RNA sequence: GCUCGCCGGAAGACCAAGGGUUCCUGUCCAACGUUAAUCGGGGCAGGGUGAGUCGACCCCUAAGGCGAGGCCGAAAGGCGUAGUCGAUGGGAAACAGGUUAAUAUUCCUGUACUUGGUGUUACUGCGAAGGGGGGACGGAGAAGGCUAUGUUGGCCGGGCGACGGUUGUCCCGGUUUAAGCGUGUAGGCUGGUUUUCCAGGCAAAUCCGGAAAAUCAAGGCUGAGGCGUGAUGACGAGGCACUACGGUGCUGAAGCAACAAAUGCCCUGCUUCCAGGAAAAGCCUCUAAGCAUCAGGUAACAUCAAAUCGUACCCCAAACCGACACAGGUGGUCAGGUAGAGAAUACCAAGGCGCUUGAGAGAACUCGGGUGAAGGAACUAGGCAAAAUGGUGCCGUAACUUCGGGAGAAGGCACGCUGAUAUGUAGGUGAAGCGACUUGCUCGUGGAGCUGAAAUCAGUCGAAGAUACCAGCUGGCUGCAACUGUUUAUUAAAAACACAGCACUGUGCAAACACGAAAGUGGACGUAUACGGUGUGACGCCUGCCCGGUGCCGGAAGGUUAAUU
RNA sequence: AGGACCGAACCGACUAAUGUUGAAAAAUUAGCGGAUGACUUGUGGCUGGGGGUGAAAGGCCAAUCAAACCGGGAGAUAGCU
């Protein structure tokens, strides 16, 4: 089991964009910023618990930092089964 | 059989092949093979320690029984094989107990023949015996120097040794160089001469033929600059000096043997 | 024409990287020198 | 937007390496961009890289590195055993459609597949750091069987012609379909099955190796492609709407056959050759210590797990390497048509471009071309440069020679189109049918169709028929080096170097010799038909004389002679 | 069969012109040579300065070579300018 604290740490923010929206309304998938070391499993469990929704699968990609000073962050494609989240 | 190639092109005009119909045409016996990576003449420091080596065809080492230890078990010759690693060529022998090994192929040996090692084997080619048991005047090959060590002498293509005398624990051998050497009579030997005596009749015919034996070109000393070789420069072809190695030791006559540990065994230095 | 610098990250790290410097005392002295001078980029290792 | 030019085995597409956000979108025009710029790889802001199956990581190893102890060496350190790393190599598995402004074998849709764990049930000998198989291998060449792919017919949808003609031996487009699963064939290879026994594989084994005996030899492995299914699916020429004029939605006909086919596959095959062609793991089998109504194994079935990381973009280039948006360099993969032997070349297709200064004029002179009357090397250091020759078939061909050459020697001649032979021939491919059978991915026979040279004869055209591009100038006499090769990156490609061969000399193995204060290592896992050094330089005919000197080799009677005492 | 032959890719580099403040710190253009080999190329490795490596040219060793580069001795020394 992944304990409560890590779940409270792995979800940073919901990623909002045209891709993120269209993903929500077509694939029923939500896009999140997650802790850079979060795992498919950790994101899955955290979403299921903290959002009380049911998830099919998680796809993750690390977005490389843009010159400025942007830090590398991980983007998560969370595919819900049927619950409406937000 | 030595065969001349017809001169359909330069580089074939002078080739003389040594073709042997009895050599096995398949692959060798895989249980007696090891990888044998080339060196280029470099030692573990990475420096060339022997010049003119490198390139050449890839070769797998065949494990050859030089010791001939299985005493009293007769063995039959299965086939004769090309061996890239010797000038001689080898024979796969099967022992009646189910073991196979490679030996140097004696002169007349051929597939189906029976060989045997021991103290009681018969005096005939291919049989390995301690030199106590071999008649004086015999022609042997693959001779040992220290008992149980393995054959080291007379082991190239057409070579052999004559057991000249037996005086106590030592036999006097006429090595192929013309040297009389004493060796303990407990050292083993094989009757006969090493086969493939025609090996020396081949003519490579072209530079590439040498290159694919791994032999790289030799630049003459006198063709270099003075900083490169003692046979230095000159305007034109100049020599004017006593010939030497690249390291300045007089070649053409000067004698380099300096071993007093084994001088006791040299009955007569070659000539 | 072919110029002298033909980059290769593997070869770079093997030839001048941090652990290659640390392998021998002479490399560790290179590192000590570069710290003493205060180099921002201590080796090629990126 | 319409034309026109250019590339097209690339200047198209796709990657690796390298780079690093250049990607896509909106704004902007200071600087940057060799000009202007409203544009941009520029500035600024926002987005974009989704994986059990692709790669990395990972299991395993090569060259090599490092290396517990160890052996060495003033120290620092060197080498190296057990080991441990290290790909450029070997180890499990996904494909087709659709999608975004930018990601797709990753998303979605359809159809799959792999490897473990965990249960449950059945049935059981399981179990190594060990053994034996396997992995697992060269070069050349020659088929055959195929496929990608093309071409043509048929089919289906549309057309009826800006100018004579054009309801047809007309015109134009489409005619696509995968992993997987079933099947097992053109090939390729080996006989098989029991029984007994053992001087082998550390020991030992039922595995493998050997030796017998019997009985069948007709048994098994492997392998493209085809075919069926996947798939009543998807796609599809087109319409038909709507519209931001970008584009989006909706519907959808035919979807076959023949021939010609790769450098791709069968094939790591086969044949030949000498130069004799990795390694280890996964894998499969055997047991050992052990475990023993257990554990494990094996099969079915269910369940779960397959993390992490790379994924944008450029990538023969304005994103890499060259200070530059530099005429240079840069590994792999794919590669259509018509001519053509071709990946040459000409022109094109898909696709991509027109090279980030332009507008005039139409001087000398410069550069890069074209053409020249009469001459024809008179030029010049020298035919430098230019011009010339060029293809295929066939005829013909000298001295000389090491018999292979020389030799495309030299020199000729026939090339187009049309018609006939023969409404297309020789040949290739091959349906129906017809029989057979050990009856289907069958064999024989038979030939529809399809493709299709080369010739001969006759006729015709232009000045000319290898009509372009493309594509040998040739002969004679000599020097030198035999030759193919190699070199002064960036003024010398040679007669130099190398070479096969030849000789001389060292060298008995702990070899000589080299690199190392050493340990060691190469030589060499080689053994005098072997290795090193040296001179010459294929081959033919040959290599005379001289040992004074100087080296080297052998002797040392005698003289002399060091430390030492 | 062949260090066979002709000829693309590929690898070279004989000749001529141009360029010489270049498009380029050695290229371009027209020809040229080899093109199954003593070949060519990718990726890694290995050899180090009196040292390597060299089919040998004093060639090559990061546009540097009769002794690399970098830092130190070192403000070497300079009857010379």
Numbering used by the authors:
A (entry chain t): 1 to 86
B (entry chain c): 2 to 272
C (entry chain 6): 1 to 46
Pull verbatim passages from the article behind this deposition.
Co-translational folding is a fundamental process for the efficient biosynthesis of nascent polypeptides that emerge through the ribosome exit tunnel. To understand how this process is modulated by the shape and surface of the narrow tunnel, we have rationally engineered three exit tunnel protein loops (uL22, uL23 and uL24) of the 70S ribosome by CRISPR/Cas9 gene editing, and studied the co-translational folding of an immunoglobulin-like filamin domain (FLN5). In E.coli’s 70S ribosomal particle, the tunnel’s unique geometry is shaped by the 23S ribosomal RNA (rRNA) and the ribosomal proteins uL4, uL22, uL23, uL24 and uL29. Of these proteins, uL4, uL22, uL23 and uL24 all have extended loops (ranging from 10 to 25 residues in length) that protrude into the tunnel, and along with uL29, have surface-exposed globular regions that crown the perimeter of the exit tunnel.
Within the wider vestibule region, the uL23 and uL24 loops were shortened to lengths consistent with those present in eukaryotic ribosomes with 7 and 11-residue deletions made within the uL23 (23ΔL) and uL24 (24ΔL) loops, respectively. To further explore a molecular basis for the observed earlier folding mediated by the shortened uL23 and uL24 loops, we used 15N-labelled RNC (L = 37) samples to derive structures of 23ΔL24ΔL 70S ribosomes using single-particle cryo-EM. In silico sorting of the 680,941 particles yielded two major 3D classes comprising of empty 70S ribosomes, and programmed ribosomes harbouring a P-site tRNA-bound FLN5 NC. The 23ΔL24ΔL RNCs were resolved to an average resolution of 2.75 Å, where the truncated uL23 loop is observed at high-resolution (local resolution 3–4 Å at 3σ) relative to the uL24 (local resolution >4 Å, at 1.8σ), which is decidedly more dynamic. The structures of truncated loops in the empty 70S ribosome were identical to those observed in the FLN5 RNC. There were no other significant structural differences in these ribosomes relative to the WT 70S ribosome, suggesting that the loop modifications only altered the local environment surrounding the site of mutation. Following loop truncation, there is a clear increase in tunnel volume (calculated with POVME38) by 1272, 1736 and 3008 Å3 for 23ΔL, 24ΔL and 23ΔL24ΔL ribosomes, respectively. By contrast, the NC ensemble distribution is more symmetric in relation to the centre of the tunnel on 23ΔL24ΔL ribosomes where more contacts are made with H7 and H24 relative to WT RNCs. This combined cryo-EM and MD simulation analysis shows how the truncated loops provide additional space and freedom to the NC both inside and outside the tunnel.
